[PDB]
Amino acid sequence: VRLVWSPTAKADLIDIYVMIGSENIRAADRYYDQLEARALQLADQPRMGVRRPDIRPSARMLVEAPFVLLYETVPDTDDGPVEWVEIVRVVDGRRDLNRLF
């Protein structure tokens, strides 16, 4: 399964690294290790997230604490082969959410 990222999701990743990396580069690297590892897990298991059609109909959420990956599969089906996964945003729950669920 091909894994791609929206231009904004790439910008999210850069911003996250810059924010914590401004004081702790090791922590910034650790976050990238964790986000990459989860994104790899997601490519192997495209439906591992939770469907959130109350956000948008194809939206899914996958937690990678403290972050939330918002993503979709193409096609947006419940069963069968997935051609790709698009990560649409990487959200920091500490900065943008009251609760995860």
Binding site: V4, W5, A11, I14, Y17, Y32, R52, I55, A59, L97
Partner: protein, 85 residues
């Protein structure tokens, strides 16, 4: 005025509600339920805030252009560049 309804709670919840009433914290279980539901109304508004925020962020992502693979080695180099002007 007032609206009565029949509701199902857990035995554990019912027991603590009875304890609180018997201890004089509340006059009846319905007083607890009214306080609790009012707090839930605010919780639900905060939940709706979260959903709206995620929807806004999603829509921005979906309008930002063609998605591409990410090389995290290259990405790290780019983020460190950003840190130094």
């Amino acid at each position: 005025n007032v609206e009565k309804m029949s509701v199902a709670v857990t035995p554990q919840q019912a027991a603590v509600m009875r304890e609180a009433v018997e201890a004089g914290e509340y006059a009846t279980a319905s007083e607890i339920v009214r306080e609790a539901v009012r707090d839930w109304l605010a919780k639900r508004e905060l939940r709706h805030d979260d959903i709206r925020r995620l929807r806004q962020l999603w829509d921005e992502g979906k309008a930002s252009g063609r998605p591409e693979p990410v090389d995290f080695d290259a990405l790290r180099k780019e983020a460190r560049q950003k840190l130094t002007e």
